[PDB]
Paper text:
Here, we report cryo-EM structures of human H1-containing tetranucleosome arrays with four physiologically relevant NRLs. The structures show a zig-zag arrangement of nucleosomes, with nucleosomes 1 and 3 forming a stack. H1 binding to stacked nucleosomes depends on the NRL, whereas H1 always binds to the non-stacked nucleosomes 2 and 4. H1 contacts DNA with L1, the amino-terminal part of α2 together with L3, and α3 to stabilize the nucleosome and contribute to chromatin compaction.
In all structures, nucleosomes 1 and 3 form a canonical stack, whereas nucleosome 2 is located in a DNA loop between the two stacking nucleosomes and is rotated relative to the nucleosome stack. In contrast, the presence of H1 on the stacked nucleosomes 1 and 3 differs between the four arrays. H1 is absent from the stacked nucleosomes of the 4×177 array, but is present on nucleosome 1 in the 4×187 and 4×197 arrays, and is present on both stacked nucleosomes in the 4×207 array. Thus, histone H1 is bound to non-stacked nucleosomes in all structures, whereas H1 binding to stacked nucleosomes is enabled only as the NRL increases.
Residue numbers in the entry:
A (entry chain a), B (entry chain e): 37 to 133
C (entry chain d), D (entry chain h): 30 to 124
E (entry chain c), F (entry chain g): 10 to 118
G (entry chain b), H (entry chain f): 20 to 102
Write the structure that this text describes.
Amino acid sequence: KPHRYRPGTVALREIRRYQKSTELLIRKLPFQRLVREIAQDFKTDLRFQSSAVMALQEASEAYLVGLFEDTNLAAIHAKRVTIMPKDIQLARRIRGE
Amino acid sequence: KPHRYRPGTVALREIRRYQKSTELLIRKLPFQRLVREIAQDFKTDLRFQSSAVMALQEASEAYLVGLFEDTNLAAIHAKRVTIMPKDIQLARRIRGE
Amino acid sequence: KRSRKESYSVYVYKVLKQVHPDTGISSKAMGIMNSFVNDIFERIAGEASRLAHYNKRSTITSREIQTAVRLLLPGELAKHAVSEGTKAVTKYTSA
Amino acid sequence: KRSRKESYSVYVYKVLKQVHPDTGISSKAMGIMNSFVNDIFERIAGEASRLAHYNKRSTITSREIQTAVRLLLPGELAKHAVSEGTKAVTKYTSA
Amino acid sequence: ARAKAKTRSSRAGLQFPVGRVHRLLRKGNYSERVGAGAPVYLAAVLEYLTAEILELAGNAARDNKKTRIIPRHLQLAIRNDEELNKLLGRVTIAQGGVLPNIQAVLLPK
Amino acid sequence: ARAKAKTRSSRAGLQFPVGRVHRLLRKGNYSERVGAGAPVYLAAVLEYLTAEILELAGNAARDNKKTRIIPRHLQLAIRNDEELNKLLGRVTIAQGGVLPNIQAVLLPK
Amino acid sequence: KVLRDNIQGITKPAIRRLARRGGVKRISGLIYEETRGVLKVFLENVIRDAVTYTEHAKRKTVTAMDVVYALKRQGRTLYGFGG
Amino acid sequence: KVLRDNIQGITKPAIRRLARRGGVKRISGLIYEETRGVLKVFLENVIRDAVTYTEHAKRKTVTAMDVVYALKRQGRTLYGFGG
């Protein structure tokens, strides 16, 4: 019978991997397209330095990392492990967003 | 039988009173004693403006009031109504202190 | 007499009498308005000074303060404050 | 033809060689060191400026920056920075 | 034959001081040089913010049947406008207390 | 007819530039005047901070057995020092990732 | 040249990778679209600021300086991009 | 002259009424000593800097202006005492 891990240990191997590794986690082209889409709504005909796109990429990944650490603290606070919408709402509201 | 209120009802009236009220909630001269005790740990025989002690007392009440806003949010986050030390520590950690 | 301690007292009093003829002000509320005008002045002036440094500009003008309003002030507060800023500067240039 | 762009390369290079003779540095770590020293310089300079304004002082002395680094640098780093800066101004005044 | 001393706030039609804000830009040491329209604009922004917040303060005072602004009125005026709340999230009003808000879980059924 | 130029970086014996820090203080527009000991003190603090963080970076890189420090090493250095974490609480390091910190309940058994 | 639905470009496994770097074991299914919304609002804030920096600068290309500076104002200071 | 215990000077009913202003309906018994410590730590952060302001100005008297500056440097700005 072919091998299959129990739920969770693949998640922790991912935890150890992308906490141990450093590389970018969002696919670069759709993130660039999302940024261009948002900036098109504010002032028309914008172009982007590529380094600016990777700068938004690093900053956005780290911002989500901080939020997901806060929701992790919220989830383990609520005796849970699986985070919920009200955890992000709590994290944003306590931080003041 | 003497009249008797149920728990929390007087607490809720106290709530609506203290958001309705605006005055200081810390005793003035004990707070002055505390701030002198903390001050003499850094520089001995310090002297205080009474306005400075009142400003410290207002800021301390503000800090604690906002801290219990966040603590009440964290308590209702965990499906509880009574706050706990882990709620205060959670709010303090998420805030960035 | 002593050294004069500058404030924004009569100015805010004129603003209140323009917006509310029958409503009064307390002294502690006036101290909070001094704190308000000083804090908002500090925020706008500091961020607009940094904007002046970033473009390597020796001048802070109405454009830098206008941009600083767009950064700091949210939404309709921002665009309305832009509107009264433009009416004020056009009235001043027309003397 | 190009225009010179300033960095903190050589100073961080000599410091890293002095604290570790064998250890090298990547380019991105160098950019982060440039950003770090720029951020800390701007923090200390702004706080020194605010201390200067608050007592109506138009000068920045080593006392002002000592006050600032006592404000910002937490705990043991504060007394060590006080020690190195005191030694530094000691050799500067003695020479 | 010197001209009459007119005031720049009245020149721009304002109440807040063009001259004092310009002097504080010169003495807050924020640039070497300051544009002339900048204090006029900054005074306009300050006067408009104070105008809205004093309008809400007078409205709150009329709501509480008081003819004089108390700092409680100021705190109620800050916290009941969400955009002014976002402007002043980190700022505490002296003797303003806090806005009356009770979470619905706390309230009984 | 003129003395040989010898830098105040060498006078203090600090490799951080006293002249350049003084130039950035004058052109960063923080006061009308700057005392001469202030950039010396600031450069000493700057060199101490850089020396301490680069010491931790070199130690962490040797712990990873790598002779060149990388932004991952900078993140490992900063997050493992409580005073540096206090200094850089809200500061993000590019491409450094995060300190490995798995909460205790997340571990199995 | 028209861009219409790029918020879905931040894929669900990309959100999973982000939460793995943040240290998350289990992610609910409702999480992905609202983290798209939260990240959307965050980029509205920082890109609105950077656009104001840009149009203040009278340039047409958003640069990394404007990005890092907008993050710097909001207490989200970023190193490594020339700051 | 010396003061040993003013942590108990912030009494338990005072913490109770502070949390009543905070919207807290119910308070655990272990809250009070912790909040006394937390307030003590917050006052360490404030008063250490406020002192450093005072001997920066070579003064012996702690002023309200120093307190205002120390609070606003932490981003906990207090209105009503400046000037």
